[PDB]
C-alpha cells in the first residue's frame, strides 16, 4: 500500500527557512520522479518544482527559482524541498506527489496529504475554547496561525459535525465554531502551531 | 510557459443533469499518440484526485459517468449524471512541457431543491464571561441556496460587529451551514439579543433569541 508522508510545515518569518519533507512508503521510490504542487489557501494549484529518477530536476522559474531547492534521497525513500528567502506570497498547502505514472497500460497518481506553510511576522498564540451549550458546540477563539483540528470525543463522533472555516478577525487572531445537531437526542482542539491542546465538555 | 484556460469557472448542475468543461491551451499538447492533458477532481480538505490521464483515458476506480476527449489545444470533461458526491473543483493540467501548468478550476456546484435552515442561537458561556469579551453566535444549519441574510438586533439591528463562515457543500445532501458571530465587550448593558435569518425557504423570517 502506497502513502506519501509529507511534514517540516509550519509558520516561518518572511526571509525565513523551512524544510519540508515526504517520506514514501510501499512504492518503489527509486524508480519514479516525484513532483512539489502547492496551493495559496482559497486559490488553485500550482506546479513547484520535479526531479527525476536521475537526479536531474527543474523548477517554476516564474515563481521559486533560485530560492525553492528539490531534493531526493533514495536510500531513504524521501523526497526533499528546501525553501529559503521566504516571502508571503509562498503561504501555501505543498504537496508531493508522483503525478501521472503510466505503464502496463494502467494509470496510476499517488498524492500525499499536505503540509501548510504560512509565512508571516506575527507571533504563534494558542486558541481558548469556550463551550456552546443548548445543537452544540465549540468555540474555538484568537489563535494563530492555521490551522486548528477539531474532534468530538476523542474522534469517535463524526455523524452532523460541522466545522466551520476559520474567519481572521480584526485582532490579526482566528476564529471558528464547530457545532453539532443534537435535537434534544439525549470537543477536541488541536493546534499544533502553539503545541497546545484542550478538551472542553 | 503554457497558458490554460478552462471554462466555465462555476458551474451549477443538478443531480441527472450532463456537466461539460473545457481546458484551452496556447499550445498544442500531441507528442506521438498522446495528448498530454489530465484532468483531477479535488474535494474539501482532500488532495487532488486523478480523474483522466492523456485527455481520454479513465483512471482506474473512476465510475464511467467521467469522460474525457479532445486533442490538440481544446479539450473536454463531460459528466453524464452528475451525483452528489461529484461536489468539488475540477483541474486541468498539461504535462507535455516543463513547466507543468494547471487551469483555474471549474467548481461543480450541486442543484438540489430548496431547504430551509434550521436556526439556533448560543448566548456566551460562563468561562468566557470570566474574560473582556462576549461572543455570540448564530448557526443556520442545512440549507440550500447559499444565499442567506443574517440580521442581529435591543431591538438595535447591528452593523459592522459581526463576521459569517460558511461550509462548503455537503457530499451526501449538498447542504451549506453557515455561523454568525456577534462580538461585543457592553454586553452586560443590554437585555435583548436577536438573530433574524431571511431565506428562500423559509415563508417569513425565523428570529432566535435570548434574554
Known amino acids: 500500500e502506497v502513502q506519501l508522508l509529507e511534514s517540516g510545515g509550519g509558520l516561518e518569518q518572511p526571509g525565513g527557512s523551512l524544510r519540508l519533507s515526504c517520506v514514501v512508503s510501499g512504492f518503489t521510490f527509486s524508480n519514479y520522479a516525484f513532483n512539489w504542487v502547492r496551493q495559496a489557501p482559497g486559490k488553485g494549484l500550482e506546479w513547484v518544482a520535479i526531479?527525476?529518477?536521475?537526479?536531474?530536476?527543474?523548477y517554476h522559474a516564474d515563481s521559486v527559482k533560485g530560492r525553492f531547492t528539490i531534493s531526493r534521497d533514495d536510500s531513504k525513500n524521501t523526497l526533499f524541498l528546501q525553501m529559503n528567502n521566504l516571502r508571503a506570497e509562498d503561504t501555501a498547502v505543498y504537496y508531493c506527489?508522483?503525478?501521472?505514472?503510466?505503464?502496463?497500460?494502467?494509470?496510476?497518481?499517488?498524492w500525499g496529504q499536505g503540509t501548510l506553510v504560512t509565512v508571516s511576522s506575527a507571533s504563534t498564540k494558542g486558541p481558548s475554547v469556550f463551550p456552546l451549550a443548548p445543537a452544540l458546540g465549540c468555540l474555538v477563539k484568537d489563535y494563530f496561525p492555521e490551522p486548528v483540528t477539531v474532534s468530538w470525543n476523542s474522534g469517535a463522533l463524526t455523524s452532523g459535525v460541522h466545522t466551520f472555516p476559520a474567519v481572521l478577525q480584526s485582532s490579526g487572531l482566528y476564529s471558528l465554531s464547530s457545532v453539532v445537531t443534537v435535537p434534544s437526542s439525549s470537543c477536541n482542539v488541536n493546534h499544533k502551531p502553539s503545541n497546545t491542546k484542550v478538551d472542553k465538555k | 510557459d503554457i497558458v490554460m484556460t478552462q471554462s466555465p469557472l462555476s458551474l451549477p448542475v443538478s443531480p441527472g443533469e450532463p456537466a461539460s468543461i473545457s481546458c484551452r491551451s496556447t499550445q498544442s499538447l500531441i507528442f506521438g499518440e498522446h495528448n498530454y492533458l489530465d484532468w483531477y477532481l479535488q474535494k474539501p480538505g482532500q488532495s487532488p484526485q486523478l480523474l483522466i490521464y492523456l485527455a481520454s483515458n479513465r483512471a482506474s476506480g473512476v465510475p464511467d459517468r467521467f469522460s474525457g476527449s479532445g486533442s490538440g489545444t481544446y479539450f473536454t470533461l463531460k459528466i453524464s449524471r452528475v451525483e452528489a458526491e461529484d461536489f468539488g473543483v475540477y483541474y486541468c493540467?498539461?504535462?507535455?512541457?516543463?513547466?507543468?501548468?494547471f487551469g483555474q478550476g471549474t467548481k461543480l456546484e450541486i442543484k438540489r431543491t430548496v431547504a430551509a435552515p434550521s436556526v439556533f442561537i448560543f448566548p456566551p458561556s460562563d468561562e468566557q464571561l470570566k474574560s473582556g469579551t462576549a461572543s455570540v453566535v448564530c448557526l443556520l444549519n442545512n440549507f440550500y441556496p447559499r444565499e442567506a441574510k443574517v440580521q442581529w438586533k435591543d431591538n438595535a439591528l447591528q452593523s459592522g460587529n459581526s463576521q459569517e463562515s460558511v461550509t462548503e457543500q455537503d457530499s451526501k445532501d449538498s447542504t451549506y451551514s453557515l455561523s454568525s458571530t456577534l462580538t461585543l465587550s457592553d454586553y452586560e448593558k443590554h437585555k435583548v439579543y436577536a438573530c433574524e435569518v431571511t431565506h428562500q425557504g423559509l415563508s417569513s423570517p425565523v428570529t432566535k433569541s435570548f434574554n
Open positions: 506527489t508522483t503525478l501521472l505514472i503510466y505503464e502496463s497500460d494502467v494509470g496510476v497518481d499517488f
Open positions: 526531479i527525476y529518477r536521475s537526479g536531474s530536476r527543474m
Open positions: 493540467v498539461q504535462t507535455v512541457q516543463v513547466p507543468y501548468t
